[PDB]
Amino acid sequence: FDMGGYFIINGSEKVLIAQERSAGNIVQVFKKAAPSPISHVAEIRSALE
Amino acid sequence: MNAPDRFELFLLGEGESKLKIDPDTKAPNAVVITFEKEDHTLGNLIRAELLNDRKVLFAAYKVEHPFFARFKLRIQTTEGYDPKDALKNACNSIINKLGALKTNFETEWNLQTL
């Protein structure tokens, strides 16, 4: 019934929790703060695959 | 860990008499009996049979805690009637009814064919 998917370091079964991040290399638009001098921004986070 | 030994529900401990008797304060011919190592088996049967006596005024029991197997029974009777005797008549009446039951059951069982 063991399903696997873990590592055995120093005899202790370790799991890698799936990590969540905002996707890269996509363009998004943000209405910035009303007290902010800039009123809008278009951000893309650039990183190579 | 902290639980008591489960034989304390019927085994009398050190210096624990089965019956302790004490007079009711501010009450005439009223006495209370501290039954030890006993549950609702005895209290309900004594009380419901005492109530059938017509010279007894009060009869009621209570388990002051379901932790401990013990209950208090208090009786009040007419003047010239010690509740010990009222208790004894009830008990003897119980055993006679029980003994009468036992013989009638054996008669009906031995009649029954299986």
Binding site: M3, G5, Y6, V15, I17, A18, Q19, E20 | -
Partner: protein, 43 residues
Amino acid sequence: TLSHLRRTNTPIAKPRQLHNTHWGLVCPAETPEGQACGLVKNL
């Protein structure tokens, strides 16, 4: 054991609330309550 293998951590703008886009991808309810609730999700 099964639930630990289908588990998600999210570091650190309203993430903790169950999102519409989570339909069918994340369990709506299976998430640790109290502190840091909604960041940690189960598939």
